[PDB]
Amino acid sequence: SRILLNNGAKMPILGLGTWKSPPGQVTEAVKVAIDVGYRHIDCAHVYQNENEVGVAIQEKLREQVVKREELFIVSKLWCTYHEKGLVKGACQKTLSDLKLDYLDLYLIHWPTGFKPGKEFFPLDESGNVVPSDTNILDTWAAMEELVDEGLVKAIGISNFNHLQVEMILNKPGLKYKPAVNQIECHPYLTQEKLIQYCQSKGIVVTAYSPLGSPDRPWAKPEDPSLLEDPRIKAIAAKHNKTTAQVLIRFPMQRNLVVIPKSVTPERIAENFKVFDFELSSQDMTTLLSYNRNWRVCALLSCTSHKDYPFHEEF
Numbered sequence: 001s002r003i004l005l006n007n008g009a010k011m012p013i014l015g016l017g018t019w020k021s022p023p024g025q026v027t028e029a030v031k032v033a034i035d036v037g038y039r040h041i042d043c044a045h046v047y048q049n050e051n052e053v054g055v056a057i058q059e060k061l062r063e064q065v066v067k068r069e070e071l072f073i074v075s076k077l078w079c080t081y082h083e084k085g086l087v088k089g090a091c092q093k094t095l096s097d098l099k100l101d102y103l104d105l106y107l108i109h110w111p112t113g114f115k116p117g118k119e120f121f122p123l124d125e126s127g128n129v130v131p132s133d134t135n136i137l138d139t140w141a142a143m144e145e146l147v148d149e150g151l152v153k154a155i156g157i158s159n160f161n162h163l164q165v166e167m168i169l170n171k172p173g174l175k176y177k178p179a180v181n182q183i184e185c186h187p188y189l190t191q192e193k194l195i196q197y198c199q200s201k202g203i204v205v206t207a208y209s210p211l212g213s214p215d216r217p218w219a220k221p222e223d224p225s226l227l228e229d230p231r232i233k234a235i236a237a238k239h240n241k242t243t244a245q246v247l248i249r250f251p252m253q254r255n256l257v258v259i260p261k262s263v264t265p266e267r268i269a270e271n272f273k274v275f276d277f278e279l280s281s282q283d284m285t286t287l288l289s290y291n292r293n294w295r296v297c298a299l300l301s302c303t304s305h306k307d308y309p310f311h312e313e314f
């Protein structure tokens with residue numbers, strides 16, 4: 001149920017996502033999750049609910065349902081903090097909100113730096129995001145210092161394409177390799193090329209939006225529905241499991257970590273019940289065949305950033 005990272009630590013292959021979890025409901029969602037067995041929580045400052053996640057974690061530690069060493073807590077450096085001088089402060093705010101004295105993993109959330117300020121998405125008068133003149137290698141060095149200071153046990157990246165991964169790997173004076181690349185991944189966006197690249201470099205891949213993020217605020221009704229894909233439902237039926245459970249088990253069997261989000265206690269529990277069955281090799285290849293290169297997570301206003309990651313093939 002855990003995978004070995006290149007930093008020597010073990011990461012649970014199933015975690016709870018918290019993007020879009022309302023602040024008034026996420027405390028209970030994370031308490032329920034830890035009660036039913038989750039030991040990995042995926043967080044971010046930009047999700048604006050870390051204080052409330054933190055309440056849950058702290059309460060379960062206080063109740064001795066879990067000890068700190070058994071938890072694997074992940075957070076992410078937001079785009080407006082890529083400057084070398086801001087990275088520590090961003091990490092300590094996340095730590096302060098989560099009521100932790102270290103993070104198990106801290107990720108560069110997106111490869112694109114934006115102008116620092118109070119705005120998460122600073123725009124110019126015509127709507128383009130205002131970039132920062134920070135490059136991912138200086139940002140990376142600043143992340144490495146967090147390891148040396150003991151604020152984080154591992155560092156990694158997210159939404160980096162393979163040329164941007166390669167840039168870090170080739171960084172002159174590279175001190176800690178990224179441990180994880182967290183990317184969008186589901187049967188409509190299977191990422192075989194990027195995943196193979198990352199794994200071949202011993203970088204663990206975490207698959208986000210594994211259910212297709214049907215609650216993403218920019219969803220359109222024309223938009224496909226993984227959960228309602230009758231081919232996926234048939235595979236679930238074959239296994240006496242729900243479609244969500246198949247969608248969660250699928251990345252696990254490609255040696256990925258996967259982080260489904262839910263604030264519904266029945267679904268939190270359901271999503272955890274994925275260790276009692278296995279998809280066949282043929283099931284796996286069939287699921288891979290549904291790839292559409294359909295990406296649910298990105299943003300127009302950022303398309304001219306120099307470091308925009310999805311122009312590349314992979």
Ligand SMILES: NC(=O)c1ccc[n+]([C@@H]2O[C@H](COP(=O)([O-])OP(=O)(O)OC[C@H]3O[C@@H](n4cnc5c(N)ncnc54)[C@H](OP(=O)(O)O)[C@@H]3O)[C@@H](O)[C@H]2O)c1
Nearest residue numbers: 017018019208209210211212213215244260261262263264
């Ligand atoms: N690094 C990045 O840039 C990045 C980007 C996107 C996401 N992520 C991370 O990955 C997580 C997961 O991705 P996501 O939030 O985009 O979406 P997701 O996990 O693919 O989908 C969550 C949606 O599915 C619903 N759902 C959950 N379990 C279900 C089940 N068993 N049956 C039916 N519906 C179910 C949830 O509903 P309820 O909550 O109402 O139950 C919610 O509407 C995020 O929360 C975040 O932690 C990271």
Ligand SMILES: O=C(O)Cc1nn(Cc2nc3cc(C(F)(F)F)ccc3s2)c(=O)c2ccccc12
Nearest residue numbers: 019046047110111112297298299302305308309
């Ligand atoms: O980030 C989350 O975890 C989920 C997430 N995704 N997106 C879609 C995005 N698309 C991007 C594209 C770039 C780009 F690199 F391409 F420029 C940079 C940054 C982003 S945010 C959002 O706009 C967002 C807003 C608030 C909280 C979470 C999110």
